[PDB]
Every structure is written in structure tokens, then in C-alpha cells.
Design a protein around this ligand. Structure first.
Ligand SMILES: CC(=O)c1sc(CCOP(=O)(O)OP(=O)(O)O)c(C)[n+]1Cc1cnc(C)nc1N
Ligand code: SF4
Ligand code: SF4
Ligand code: SF4
Ligand SMILES: [Ca+2]
Ligand SMILES: [Mg+2]
Ligand SMILES: [Mg+2]
Lengths: 1231, 117, 235, 58, 118
């Protein structure tokens, strides 16, 4: 049968893919991850596919390994599927050519997402799918959540019958994450449509040793082209097979499809051709405009490959005079984008009527594609007829964009209610909206849609929900721009964002705030909001949700109150029904830990309904006077680009605001000052011991240790309390721990760690600290940092250096950022950083927020993100440039020494040459050369002077997480370390792929619960460290900040100064590990990870072996017996103990055994006298030799592969036996 | 399964052009590199010898258990286990939770005990 | 000056690519292997490029490794090249989008070879170059051994001046391995055609901690499209 | 009466330079591709040349 | 019915032996990340590496399996890094069977390895 369901496009397509496949090889990539995660949940829950079996699923090391596995499972006769997108699809391309080449029934489900070029984007467009159009896969597009279900089913059925593999795709986020009320088929119904003869023939042709064949031969020019064209008949039948399965599915659902479908006026003169979610919005606008007499239409493309011109023409009205083909991609330099080119070829081939064809581009990286934009496209065909345009941007540089009039009418069907909700992350707003879509969808005949917009900020982020409810189907594949209901769940947003933008005249606005009085409301509501509320006649509602939740016991949690406000005031359901359904659900869900929690909640609803009364505002609001702008001094860049983006206006920035290559300046985060902490530390100078440990640990650089001489403290505020500095080196100096209360994230690690039992840091509410600490921070920031007073690599002295990575969007308490911040305090001014994609790239460089910054001299980390897979190779490449360019500088310096250059210049050049690979000597001599050769523009000295940014030895670092280092990027990591060159690799091991949502990696440990290891991982953690210590010439170390800051710093110094490759692996705590007492315990958890023996600390240093000493050194001690409490204090282990206690006890026991054996191995390692010696380099010199030179026998074969310009000389090819057999034979025959 | 290096590495290497050609063209580097090889194998064999002599070993189990049932890593956690981004968003995410902006459990408790009312 | 030589397409192009590059990251794949091998031989031998230096060449673990290294050498201001084909070129695709997206003057020399579908083939066709036509590289074909020298040289000169990366390609075996008597240019003639100001500006905009920037940001729907169209003037 | 257009610069594809090389007398043109894109309405150089002619509008 | 389905699966009755074959360029370099993953999975597959200590088919290029001092393409003055120890890296898992063979040294050790590994 048919079943109704409110789900998203990912889950509508996994529904079908699970049913129809026996095997799935998977790899996580946003926005497709959801499909693999649901398949795994369903396989563990006991769901059966159409064969009555549980799906066989395995996670690979990359999408390339996933595609190779899919290929082998298909070749071996199993129906297989995979889910992917963007960079991941590109890694599958090579195997896509094989899968289609061998005519295997595979089905890929892809959420179409942008490819990373000037920037990475996780958002939706067709750049990925079009990159794979020549692989020979059939390509079937779905344009809505419902269609994702239906096309996923046609794709699998058509794949089985036609033997051509299918790629089913739908828009990333805009369809994959949109939730809709749709209908799905039962698995029995899907099974009934399968062509049993074709399935049997698929099994019988598969690989099997009882009836073998050879596949994947290598072919010469004699037969390859014939072999390539032997599949044509299969490709000729697929369009008809697809068409037939569209009719069969339709006989079960009543939803009909064609290869190309047409919608709009039958006599249309202007027609759009489009594919994916844009088709829904275009259809909506056509319904609106065509009813007004506009002669317009749309051709929807369902089957993009094979491209059947006769089906395209079946969909084209003969009255069409102009046609615009929209492509959701950009192919730079091509004469047109792919769909446009396919359409042009159909008209040229036809050779008859030629109706004006235009090409348009839209929607890159999920850019809105709104009704006003569709209107523009249709208006263009009756007006200017601009060709090769763009829509949705202002292109003031090349003039390709179409003007968009946003005054365009709302085109949603009569009856539709549109709502927007402004939330603050973790406030439960998104959860309530989803539940509200479920409740309403399940108890009414209304269609329902939800789409959620999230921040790049990981903590305290803003969420905006877009919900629609209607009596007619919702084709509105764009954000709500004209709302009936707008709710602001966070009062602080009132004076920072345009909350009421687009709200309909007389629409309703509910605010969560304690400003209950007209005097309170008059004090906090911006004159702009009063203006709008009054001039638009809005039904304004204020509710002090935090007060109601505190009163009924829901501890200040506002979600149930705001949920009550929607049900009562949004008008989708009449009072009694809505309030009834609401209370009914607080039973359905909940009832978990007693009737107290069910009562807590039901009372909240009751008080909320009572309190939800209209706020009565005076008429004066209609002309409330504008305010001032106590704006701080910022940048010309922060003002003109970053602030606009942070205040949700980035869409208004024209193409001329951006650099062509995508670069951003450093340091934009300095001005964000978000202030999202609930509590922040307060300093207590009487208890302060001045250790600087609190600043060392902070994941956001929110603690600034001040060291001032009394004259620098002369212009400071009265509460700028300073102590007299302790220490010999310090003395007439005043010390102050300055909290940065607006950049603090409220994690609590600093006060958790503050050494004195009588704490020098105490967490207090933000609001009790900001008025004093903000101006103090502003003063403290102008005090010169005393980087010269204590050794830079000492604990305390490290915190008197400028931190060059501050105020990132990482989560509060994140276990990665403390580490990278101190790495910058040691080497930031000379570093290059090749960052893998992962949390570190996302908190590291999500536009417009750049947390890396320059020092006072304008020096700081040059940072880049290439891809997820190649970080070590990208870093290696930066090293290769530095090798070549600094060698060129050395060569010029040697030449200048044999010239008439002055003695001072030659002395410096000589000192530079002697210490060029030394950080201290190369900067000493390079700074003299910078002086001596200033202004020099001619000859050799002029060449040397223009290379001054190469004088000081650089420090190349490769940063990345465990998923990068242990899985996808391991091959490149291992090659780069084996290279023997001077690069430094720092792995933040979070023991999961964190950014993408907590999937298992080979670094995940035994028994840990993670996605794809949902019953606790059943293979131990891979020992990357011991694998790389087998090289002998690589420095390797492990660190854990909470255990010893001292060992960390020592490792940093030893690793960086090693004149060869270095690998450092840090224990990094993450929210995904479920720290039970909060991320503020991260440092303590890092200490325990080491004391328990779970994460032992060591250093492997090849320069000790070079001096005949053992390179292996153990820095931590024997396991102290606390493992069990270490494990049970994290949810990734504790959830398992709660749900599978039998399995969990054995798995925690296993971990105990693993760490015990591995510590004992590390102990014999540290006791050995057998060690691989060391040599940094030395030898080579000028000249080469071929391996084949002077060989007694041929060293190359008779093939085209080994042929070379100089090969072909006669030689003994081993067909006459050995030298000795040949001489024996000769002695035996003679004559 | 094999025995200690018998001393014939030099003969071994020089019987193959891939080594002997170096000796004919860069004799000094070649004799260093062939000696380095002999050192490497000497050290490696001693390493294989303590491996073969150890009593510290990685135990073994082919598999066993699992069964039906799985759990999400964030089920029942005391604080949020997911961030506020589009990349961690899932069909059932969105519930209210403690996002680590108010400090540790003990810090919030002690703070409550200092304010009340 | 000019000089006659009997050589194949691979070595006519390697002749130019060695002259015009400072770094090369390599990986063997037929029929392009001769270029990398000649460049490594010549490097070992002391041949100088147009800067008076020997080429810095390293072999990676794969062509995906090679393309990532090329990207990093370019991003850090070294003129860089690679030699590939077929399956090898498909592994460079992801980094080709980055290298063109970042307007870097990289130059890829490809011996166009068949992709493995129903069977593998080491032989010549444009299946592999056409698989990369949307990466944003400029694509310049040579149709003879002599044209392979000349177009190699145009692609290097044009990439430095335009900051758009180029893929110079010629038929696997049919040009790469055909031998002809042709004319080649001395390296000093090649050096005389370089736009020295475009080269100096490529160094100045490159990664360096003395005047840093951030590259490879991640962008939301607010700005990504504008950001992608910003390169138009360059193409 | 026959001829050939040799493509040098395949990307960026400049239609004005292709037309600069096309004789006004040409009545039939065959675009040869050295590839196969299974299912495509045509191979790449053919599709590019079709677009030059449709865009020209003559 | 059931019996006809079972009968139609007869080419599955005998347990099969899945082997992955490849040279050292594959195993030590380009396909190493995939090989490491597959070994780490704990499934019943058999990998057989024919180490010729160079990329042979393509023309004798150095690979991480090439030893110190060997002359090969890209190692034109003798390789200056030692042979990668793939055998000792994969032994760090503890649950992977790992063995080395040399036919001319012992046919009997080779045959015992094949029986044990499979
Ligand atoms: C943003 C995006 O596209 C990242 S985020 C990264 C998660 C990284 O895990 P790791 O442990 O390395 O780092 P962590 O987050 O610190 O834990 C993945 C899986 N990807 C998705 C992905 C998948 N496959 C490929 C080829 N490219 C990408 N970008
Ligand atoms: S950690 Fe505590 S005692 Fe140490 S400097 Fe910071 S506030 Fe003072
Ligand atoms: S509470 Fe957390 S973010 Fe705030 S200053 Fe302390 S360690 Fe830093
Ligand atoms: S590593 Fe974990 S705690 Fe840090 S930003 Fe990523 S998800 Fe958040
Ligand atoms: Ca180092
Ligand atoms: Mg991780
Ligand atoms: Mg080999």
C-alpha cells in the first residue's frame, strides 16, 4: 500500500534505497550523510529489504574506496547502492566509468552540492552531478521530496532491467533537508515491480569460480573502439525502460512522470527548461502568472542522461518563441552550461524551427531561487532577451545579472500559512517546529513544509525556521519572505537583526522577553520595530517565557511556551483542536521519567495560553524617533563586508566586493564580540598565583595575561586591579589576568583548572561582569605584550606571546583550539598551515569570520584549506616551493659573495647562508640584509632584496583531524612523512569524524558508540603512531594538554626543530564524546586519559639514535587503574552500558586489556638497545644513471609501456637460459 | 622462519644491475648506500628477533556478538552532543540541551548555591 | 636561437616544461611517463631552467597526491607543472577545481589517453581531457610533435600572464611517441618572452607568513555564487 | 571544395575565433570528436560548435 | 518454492576464497590507504603482494618499496630513503595475519603460508 509520512528528501530516498539493495558501501559527506545513517539505524532495528534480509552496510576510508567496493559487490552479483555528493562524487568518477562500462545495475543517490573552487560550500547546486555526466551513468533528477521517493524507485527498477547504472539526484539541502508531508510505498509494492528475469540474469552473469569469466582486460587499438561501442543497444533501451517504470509506479501512486514534463499555458510563447527543486518554484509562479493571461510554461527535466530529444520535443509547445534553459552550475570558459548545450543540440539536429534560446545560471551554493527571480527570467524573454545571464546576484563587474524586483507578489497558493521562527541554538526551537509539523501533518489534511537555516557558528548560533502549512500542495522551494507569523525566541536579537523583514500587514509577531511593561518595552525595542509594528497593524505578543518555565519548574526552558504560542496564535488550527493536540503529544512523547515531567509541561501550556494576550502599544510607535550608533572602531573590511554578512545581508553584496581567487584577510574575528556566554570567569587577584595556566587552556583566547610597568597602567580604569609580578625576571612589573567577557564562550575550563583550592577564577553571570570588564579589556588590549621577558617555549612565557588564532566559531570548550592557539604563540609568525577539511577548517575559516590574525609586525600564519584528502600533500607542496625558492636565494647569495658587494653585505650574506635553515640565525642575518639592501632595485643585490620574505626559515605545518589522518588522507600522510622532508604534522584526534556528525573513524576506540559503530566499535583503534615509528627517520610524539602543558611545549619544540618529518598526535575532547560534567572538564579528561593509560605519552626522536641513544622515550606512567571511570564519564561509552550492558562490560574490559598490552609494549620499546640509526641526508651530487645502463640482459620488456626515446638496442632477453647454461651449451656444441 | 644475516648481502646487491650500476658511476655514494642497507637489515633482523622472543602480545578474537539494536551516541547525554550547524543537523535533531555556555555541572551548581533566592 | 632535433612529442614538451618551471610533482602513467623521467634525469644532471636553477621534482604516492602537491607549490609562489593522462588525470580533478578557482598559474601536460570502462587502454584519445573540461583549466591542443613544443611554450607563458591554469594536451602515442625532426627554442629565448611583472605579482600574492592571507574559506549561500563569478574578468 | 578548422584553444571556447576560421561558403560541417559520452545528445566539440551556430542566430 | 530458490543459489554453496592481487606500487603507495582500511575491517579476504621493489610495468619507477641505494626512475642516484616496512605496519593491528615469502628460499614455507593465510 501507500503510507503518508512527513520526512525530508534524504529520508524519502533512503526508504527506497534500503528496500531495493542488498549491499551499501558508505562514506559521510554533507548533505548526504543522513541517508547512510538511516540505513544503518534501520539495519540495526531489524528492517528487511525486499529479499527479507537486513542491508549489508560497510563504511570505507573514502568515497573512492566506497565506489571500488560498490563495483566489486555489483560484479559479484549483489544489488548495491551508495549515497554521496560533491567532492565525494568526484572521487567515485573513475569507478563510475567501470560500473557503466561493465553494465552493472548500480544506483548512486546523490545530494547535489557545490564543488570547492575559490571556496568550499556544503550547499546545493549541480556542479557535482554535471562533472560525472560523461561516466555513462543514467541521470535521473527529482525536484521535490515526494519525487525523491518516486524517482529513487524508478532508478533502482530501471537499473536492474536495463543493466545501465543510475545516478538519482536531488538538490543539496533545498530538497535533501526540506521536510514535507508525502506518500511512500510499502516494500512489498516495490518488490512487485522488479523484473525477476532481469534479476536472475544479473546473478547468472556475475563473477563466480564455478562459471568464471575475465573482466577488466587491457585492449590494443585493434579492438578497443569496437569494445566501447558494443553497449550501444543497452543505452538505446534505457529511456523506454525508464518511461515504462514511470508508468508502473504511477499505477500504484497516481503520480505520473515523463522523461520531460511540461507545465503552464498550452499556447505558451516563453518557456523555461530547468531541473531539480527550481522546477517547483517555477511551477508555482506559472500558476500565478498564467491565470493572469501570461503565455508562459516550463519543461521539467527528469531524465538528463540519456538525453532524448524526441521526449524533449514532445514537451515543447509549438507556439514557443523564446526558451531559456537554466543551469545550476558554472563551467568557466565553456560556450554554455551543460543543459543549455544539450538543448541547443536538439534544435540543431531537428533542423527546422529555431525559437530563440537563452542560457541562464542560478542557485549556486543554495543561493535563493525565489518567485521574484523566476518573474525576472520570464520578463527577460519579453524584454531585453539578455543571454548567458545570472540571476540571484548583482554582477556589477561583468554585467551578466538580471535585475530582480522583490516587490513581486506572494505566489503561494490561496490558504497557505507561512511562519518564521528566530532561535538561539540549543533552545529547542527547531525541535518544537519539527514536532509541530508532525502533529499538524498527522492530525489534519494540511500539507506541511519545514526548512531550517543554520549559522556557521557552532555554539550560541542563530537558527531561523521556515514553516508552511496549506490546503494545497507546497511547491515553495525558497525561504519564507512574506510571513503570517513571526516569532523571536531570543530577545537579544531585537536590536541586531531585521526580524520583521517581509512580515505581512497585520501579521502576528510574538516576542520572548521580560519587557512586560510599556516602559520596559519602550526602553528595549528599537524605534524601527515600533515603527513597523504600528504601521503594519501587527498583532504583537510578548511572553516572558523564561519566567513561566521557571515558575512551572521547566527550569527556564522556553520551548514548550513558544510552542504553545504557535499553536494558539499561528492560525493553522482552531483553538480547541490545537491546544488539544498539543496536550495529547506531551503524553505521546514524554512520560519518560514519570508524570511529574508530563505535568511540568502541561502546566506550561496552560499558563502560556493564559499569558498569550495581545500587547497594547500606543499610536506614537508609528513615529518613534531613530537612535544613535555607539558602534566601535572597526575595519574598512569589517564595516563594508563582514558586518553585512554577519547581519544576514550578505546576499546584497555585489560581485565586486570579493577577491577573484576567494582570499580573505586575517583577523576579522577580532571585531565580532558576540557575547554569547551565560557565565564567564571572574578574576580573584588575592588568590591568583600568576601561573598563566588559565590563558594556556582557553579554547577561544578569551583570557589575556597582562604584564605592565607602572607607567603603562597610568591611564587605566580604577577596577583595573593588578598584582606585583612574582618571579626574578619580572619585578617592577604588574600582573593582571584580564577576562575577555564578550569572546568567552562560558565553558569553564580555566576556572576548573585554576590551581589554588581557593580559586582565582569563579564563574559568574555575564551580565554581572560586562560593564566592568569590557572597557578593561579594551584598555588591556592596548598594553604591549611582553614577549621578550620570559622564554617563549616556557608555560608562563608562552602566554606572554601574541596568540595568532582567537575567537573562532569552535564549540564552547572545544579540545582542538587550545592546542592550535599555543602552536601559534611559538611559531605563528613564520608558519604555513595546510589544513584538512574538518572542524579545524570550519572554525578556522568559515566566511566572514577569520580567527587567525597577524602580530603587531603584520606577521602570522599563512593558512589554506585545499581538500579533505590532500592536506599532507598540499603542505608538502608548500615545502617544495620553499625548497626551490630558498635554494634559488642561496644561489644568488653565493654569486653575490663573488662580486663587488660591500663587506657588510657579504658578511650578512655569509651568516645567512650559514644559518639559512635556522630560525634564529636566518632571521638575524635576514634582518641585516633587509636593512643593508633597502631600496636596492638593480642586478643581483636587487634580486636578493626582492626575496626578503624568504630570508627567515619558514615552518610548514599540516593540521587535520583523525578522520583525515587515519582514513582518507592516510595514504598521502604516510607518503609525505616517508619523504624525509621538513614538515610538521599535527593531528587533532577527536576519535570520530566530528564536523560531519560523529561518525566512526579508524581512530575510534573499541566499544565507543559513534555513527556506523552504534553497538560500540568492534575493532580497536588503529595505531598510527607505531606504524609511523617503523620508518625510523620520522619524529613521532603524542600529547595531552590536561596531563602536561610542559610535555606539549617540549614536543612542539622538538618536533619543529627536527630537520625531517614530524608527526604529533593530540588528544582532543569534543562534544560528540558526551563529557558528562561538561566540556569545562576537558582538561581534566585529558589528564585522566593519560593517567588511566588510555592515552600514553611518548616521543620518538631519530636524532637520539644518530648519537647511539634510544630514540623512544616514555613520558607518562603505567595505567593507574582508573580506565573504567574515564570511560563511564563519557556518553560515547556510557550509553552502551545503559542499553547493552552485557556487551558494554566486555568492551570496556577489552579496552582495559588493549591499553595494558600497549603500555607494556611501549615499555620494552623504551628498554631496547636495538635501534634504527639516523642520517638527515648527505651525498647525491651531480649526475644520473639509468637502472638499465650496462646490464648483462635486457632490463626492459617488448611493450609500448616501457618504450622510451632511447630504448631499442639489442640485448639478451632471457630466452636462451642463464649465462652459465649458455656457456655450457656452447662448450657442448663448439664445432 | 629464516636465520640471521649470513654476510652475503654485498654479493647479493652487486649481482644486480640496479645496485651495480651505482657502483660504476658514483662509487663513493654506492659503497655508503650498500653499507647502509647492510646496517638496515642487521637492525631489522634484531627487531624481528625480539618480536619472536616477546611475551607481550596482542591477544585474539575473530568476532562475536553485536546482534539487533543500536543506539545514538547522544542518547541520554547531560550536555549537547551536536553543534548548531547545518552539517550536524539531522531529522530528529533540535531538542533543547545544555550547550556548555554556562560552565561545568559543578560550576553551575555552586553558582546556584551562591544565588538561590 | 632555434635548433633542429629529432625527438618525440613527450620530449619536445618536456624540453619546454623543464625550462619554464621551478617545481614538478610526478607520478608514472603511460604514455606520459617519459616527460617526468626526462625532467628528473635533466634535474639530476644539473640542467638549468630559465632561473638558472635545477628543477625541484618529487614523486608522490598517486596523481591525487601529485595534484595536491602542485596546488601547494603554486599557492606558495613556485611555478609548477605535472605530466599525466587518463586515470591519472581523473585523480587530479578535485585539485584542478581548486587550482583554477584560486587563479594559480599551473601548467599540466597531458598525453591524452583512453579511460578504463569496458576494458583498460593505454592508447590515445580525448576521453580523459574531456573529463576535465569543467574544472576551469584553459585547454590547448597540439596536433603534431612540432606543435607540442610550441603550444607547451604558449601554455606556460599564458598561464603566468593570465593566472588561469592551463592543460596542454596531445595525443597519447600518436603524438607523444611519434618521432619527428623539428625545431626547438633555446631556454634564453623562452625566458625573454616571460612577463616579469606578472611573475613578480604571482610571488607577491602567494602564501607567506610575512604578509599572510586566508585561502580556501567555506562560504554560505549568502556569498558563494558572487564569489564564483568574481573570476570572470580573468577568463 | 573542402577544408578543415583545427581547434587549438578548446577552453575558453571563443565562437568569434571559430567563425573567423569558417568559410562563408561552407554548407555542411562535420565535427569530429575523439571520445564517447554514452547517452549524451552528442560529443563535446560537436555540442560546443552547435552552440556557436545557435547563438550566432543566422 | 523455497527449494527452487535454494537450488538456484548452488554456485554459492561452496565457501569461496576472495583474493586481492597487486604489486608493490599498488600496495605501498597508491592503494595503501585502501589496503590498510580493508585489512583493518577484520573480514575474510586474502591479499597477495608481488613485490618487485619498483613500479615494473610502467618502466621501473621507484616506489616506497624500493630499498636504499637501488637505482630506479626517480631514484637516478640510488634511493635515499629506506624501504617502507609494510609488514610491520600491518602487524600493529594484532588481528591481521601477515607473512613474507621467497619461493627460492623455501617452497615449503610458501605453501604453509598460503594454507595458513587462506
Ligand atoms: C566540511 C566538509 O565538507 C568535511 S568535514 C570531514 C569530517 C572530518 O573529520 P576529522 O576527524 O578529520 O576532523 P574533525 O571534524 O576535527 O573531527 C568530512 C568527513 N568532510 C566531508 C568530506 C568527505 N569526502 C570528501 C572527498 N571531501 C569532504 N569534504
Ligand atoms: S590559572 Fe588561576 S592562579 Fe593561575 S594565573 Fe590564571 S587566575 Fe591566576
Ligand atoms: S570559560 Fe572557557 S572560553 Fe571563557 S575564559 Fe574560561 S576557558 Fe576561555
Ligand atoms: S572538534 Fe568537537 S568540540 Fe571542537 S568544534 Fe568540532 S564538534 Fe565542536
Ligand atoms: Ca620538523
Ligand atoms: Mg575527528
Ligand atoms: Mg612492482
Amino acid at each position: 500500500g501507500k503510507k503518508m509520512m512527513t520526512t525530508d528528501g534524504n529520508t524519502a530516498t533512503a526508504h527506497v534505497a534500503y528496500a531495493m539493495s542488498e549491499v551499501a558501501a558508505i562514506y559521510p559527506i554533507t548533505p548526504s550523510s543522513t541517508m547512510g545513517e538511516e540505513a544503518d539505524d534501520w539495519a540495526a532495528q531489524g528492517r528487511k529489504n525486499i529479499f527479507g534480509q537486513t542491508l549489508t552496510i560497510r563504511e570505507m576510508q573514502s568515497e573512492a574506496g566506497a565506489a571500488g567496493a560498490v563495483h566489486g559487490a555489483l560484479a559479484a552479483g549483489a544489488l548495491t547502492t551508495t549515497f554521496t555528493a560533491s567532492q565525494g562524487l568526484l572521487l567515485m568518477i573513475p569507478n563510475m566509468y567501470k560500473i557503466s562500462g561493465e553494465l552493472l545495475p548500480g544506483v548512486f543517490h546523490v545530494t547535489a552540492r557545490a564543488i570547492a573552487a575559490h571556496a568550499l560550500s556544503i550547499f546545493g547546486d549541480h556542479q557535482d552531478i554535471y562533472a560525472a555526466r560523461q561516466t555513462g551513468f543514467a541521470m535521473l533528477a527529482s525536484s521535490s521530496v515526494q519525487e525523491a521517493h518516486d524517482m529513487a524507485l524508478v532508478a533502482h527498477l530501471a537499473a536492474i532491467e536495463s543493466n545501465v547504472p543510475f545516478m538519482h539526484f536531488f538538490d543539496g539541502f533545498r530538497t535533501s533537508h526540506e521536510i514535507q508531508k508525502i506518500e511512500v510505498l510499502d516494500y512489498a509494492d516495490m518488490a512487485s515491480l522488479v523484473n525477476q528475469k532481469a534479476l536472475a540474469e544479473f546473478r547468472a552473469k556475475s563473477m563466480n569460480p564455478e562459471h568464471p569469466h575475465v573482466r577488466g582486460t587491457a585492449q590494443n587499438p585493434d579492438i578497443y573502439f569496437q569494445g566501447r561501442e558494443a553497449a550501444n543497444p543497452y543505452y538505446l533501451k534505457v529511456p523506454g525502460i525508464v518511461a515504462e517504470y514511470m508508468q508502473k509506479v504511477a499505477s500504484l501512486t497516481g503520480r505520473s512522470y515523463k522523461l520531460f514534463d511540461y507545465v503552464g499555458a498550452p499556447d505558451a510563447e516563453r518557456v523555461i527548461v530547468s531541473m531539480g527543486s527550481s522546477c517547483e518554484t517555477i511551477e508555482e509562479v506559472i500558476n500565478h502568472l498564467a491565470a493572469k493571461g501570461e503565455k508562459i510554461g516550463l519543461i521539467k527535466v527528469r531524465l538528463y542522461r540519456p538525453f532524448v530529444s524526441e521526449a524533449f520535443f514532445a514537451a515543447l509547445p509549438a507556439s514557443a518563441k523564446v526558451i531559456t534553459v537554466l543551469d545550476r552550475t558554472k563551467e568557466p570558459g565553456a560556450p554554455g552550461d551543460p543543459l543549455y548545450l544539450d538543448v541547443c543540440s536538439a534544435f540543431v539536429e531537428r533542423g527546422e524551427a529555431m525559437p530563440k534560446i537563452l542560457a541562464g545560471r542560478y542557485g549556486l551554493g543554495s543561493k535563493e531561487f525565489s518567485p521574484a527571480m523566476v518573474k525576472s527570467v520570464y520578463d527577460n524573454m519579453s524584454g531585453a532577451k539578455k543571454n548567458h545571464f545570472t540571476v540571484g546576484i548583482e554582477d556589477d563587474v561583468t554585467g551578466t545579472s538580471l535585475p530582480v524586483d522583490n516587490a513581486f507578489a506572494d505566489t503561494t497558493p490561496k490558504g497557505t500559512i507561512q511562519c518564521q521562527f528566530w532561535g538561539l541554538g540549543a533552545d529547542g526551537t527547531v525541535g518544537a517546529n519539527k514536532q509541530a509539523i508532525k502533529i499538524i501533518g498527522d492530525n489534519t489534511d494540511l500539507f506541511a513544509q519545514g526548512y531550517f537555516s543554520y549559522d556557521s557558528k557552532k555554539s550560541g548560533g542563530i537558527t531561523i525556521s521556515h514553516l508552511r502549512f496549506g490546503e494545497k500542495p507546497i511547491q515553495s522551494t525558497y525561504l519564507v519572505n512574506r510571513a503570517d507569523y513571526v516569532a523571536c525566541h531570543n530577545p537579544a536579537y531585537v536590536g541586531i537583526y531585521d526580524i520583521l523583514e517581509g512580515i505581512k500587514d497585520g501579521g502576528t509577531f510574538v516576542l520572548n522577553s521580560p519587557w512586560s511593561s510599556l516602559e520596559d518595552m519602550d526602553k528595549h525595542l528599537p524605534s524601527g520595530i515600533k515603527r513597523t509594528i504600528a504601521n503594519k497593524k501587527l498583532k504583537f505578543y510578548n511572553i516572558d517565557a523564561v519566567k513561566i518555565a521557571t515558575d512551572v519548574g521547566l527550569g527556564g526552558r522556553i520551548n514548550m511556551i513558544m510552542q504553545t504560542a504557535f499553536f494558539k496564535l499561528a492560525g493553522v488550527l482552531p483553538f480547541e483542536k490545537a491546544v488539544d493536540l498539543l496536550k495529547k503529544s506531551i503524553h505521546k512523547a514524554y512520560g519518560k521519567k514519570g508524570e511529574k515531567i508530563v505535568k511540568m509541561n502541561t502546566d506550561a501550556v496552560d499558563q502560556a495560553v493564559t499569558s498569550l494576550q495581545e500587547f497594547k502599544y500606543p499610536d506614537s510607535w508609528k513615529d518613534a524617533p531613530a537612535e544613535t550608533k555607539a558602534e566601535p572602531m572597526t575595519n574598512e573590511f569589517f564595516k563594508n563586508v563582514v558586518k553585512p554578512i554577519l547581519t544576514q545581508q550578505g546576499d546584497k553584496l555585489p560581485v565586486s566586493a570579493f577577491e577573484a581567487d576567494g582570499r580573505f584577510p586575517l583577523g576579522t574575528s577580532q571585531f565580532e564580540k558576540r557575547g554569547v556566554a551565560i557565565n564567564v570567569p571572574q578574576w580573584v587577584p588575592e588568590n591568583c598565583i600568576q601561573c598563566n595556566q588559565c590563558a594556556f587552556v582557553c579554547p577561544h583566547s578569551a583570557i589575556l595575561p597582562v604584564l605592565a610597568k607602572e607607567e603603562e597602567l597610568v591611564g587605566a580604569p580604577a577596577n583595573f586591579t593588578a598584582l606585583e609580578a612574582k618571579g626574578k625576571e619580572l619585578k617592577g612589573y604588574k600582573f593582571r589576568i584580564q577576562i575577555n567577557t564578550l569572546d568567552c564562550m562560558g565553558c569553564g575550563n580555566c576556572a576548573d583548572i585554576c590551581p589554588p583550592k581557593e580559586k582565582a577564577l569563579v564563574m559568574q553571570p555575564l551580565d554581572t561582569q560586562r560593564d566592568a570588564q569590557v572597557p578593561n579589556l579594551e584598555y588591556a588590549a592596548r598594553i604591549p605584550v611582553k614577549s621578550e621577558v620570559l622564554p617563549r617555549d616556557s608555560l608562563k612565557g608562552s602566554q606572554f606571546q601574541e596568540p595568532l588564532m582567537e575567537f573562532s566559531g569552535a564549540c564552547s570548550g572545544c579540545g582542538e583550539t587550545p592546542y592550535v592557539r599555543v602552536i601559534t604563540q611559538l611559531f605563528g609568525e613564520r608558519m604555513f598551515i595546510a589544513n584538512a577539511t574538518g572542524c579545524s577548517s570550519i572554525w578556522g575559516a568559515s566566511a566572514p569570520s577569520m580567527p587567525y590574525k597577524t602580530n603587531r609586525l603584520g606577521q602570522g600564519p599563512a593558512w589554506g584549506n585545499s581538500l579533505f584528502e590532500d592536506a599532507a600533500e598540499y603542505g608538502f607542496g608548500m615545502n617544495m616551493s620553499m625548497f626551490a625558492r630558498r635554494t634559488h636565494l642561496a644561489d644568488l647569495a653565493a654569486k653575490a659573495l663573488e662580486s663587488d658587494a660591500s663587506g657588510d653585505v657579504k658578511e650578512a650574506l655569509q651568516g645567512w647562508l650559514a644559518g639559512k635553515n635556522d630560525p634564529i640565525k636566518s632571521k638575524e642575518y635576514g634582518d641585516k640584509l633587509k636593512k643593508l639592501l633597502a631600496g636596492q632595485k638593480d642586478g643581483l643585490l636587487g634580486q636578493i632584496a626582492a626575496m626578503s620574505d624568504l630570508y627567515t626559515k619558514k615552518s610548514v605545518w599540516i593540521f587535520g583531524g583523525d578522520g583525515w589522518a587515519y582514513d582518507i588522507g592516510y595514504g598521502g600522510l604516510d607518503h609525505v612523512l616517508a619523504s624525509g622532508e621538513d614538515v610538521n604534522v599535527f593531528v587533532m584526534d577527536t576519535e570520530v569524524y566530528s564536523n560531519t556528525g560523529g561518525q566512526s573513524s579508524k581512530a575510534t576506540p573499541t566499544g565507543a558508540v559513534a555513527k556506523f559503530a552504534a553497538a560500540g566499535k568492534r575493532t580497536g583503534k588503529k595505531d598510527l603512531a607505531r606504524m609511523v615509528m617503523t620508518y625510523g627517520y620520522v619524529y613521532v610524539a603524542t600529547v595531552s594538554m590536561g596531563y602536561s602543558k610542559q610535555q606539549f611545549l617540549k614536543v612542539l619544540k622538538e618536533a619543529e626543530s627536527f630537520p625531517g618529518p614530524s608527526l604529533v598526535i593530540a588528544y582532543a575532547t569534543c562534544i560528540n564524546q558526551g563529557l558528562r560534567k561538561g566540556m569545562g572538564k576537558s582538561q581534566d579528561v585529558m589528564n585522566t586519559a593519560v593517567k588511566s593509560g588510555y592515552w600514553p605519552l611518548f616521543r620518538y626522536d631519530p636524532r637520539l639514535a644518530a648519537q647511539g641513544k634510544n630514540p623512544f622515550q616514555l613520558d607518562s606512567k603505567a595505567p593507574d587503574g582508573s580506565v573504567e571511570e574515564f570511560l563511564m564519564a563519557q556518553n560515547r561509552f556510557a550509553v552502551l552500558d545503559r542499553s547493552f550492558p552485557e556487551d558494554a562490560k566486555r568492551l570496556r574490559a577489552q579496552v582495559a586489556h588493549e591499553l595494558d598490552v600497549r603500555f607494556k609494549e611501549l615499555e620494552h620499546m623504551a628498554a631496547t638497545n636495538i635501534f634504527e640509526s639516523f642520517a638527515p641526508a648527505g651525498g647525491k651530487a651531480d649526475g644520473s644513471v639509468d637502472f638499465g645502463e650496462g646490464a648483462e640482459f635486457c632490463t626492459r620488456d617488448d611493450t609500448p609501456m616501457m618504450a622510451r626515446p632511447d630504448s631499442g638496442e639489442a640485448c639478451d632477453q632471457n630466452r636462451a637460459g642463464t649465462s652459465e647454461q649458455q656457456g655450457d651449451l656452447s662448450k657442448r656444441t663448439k664445432k
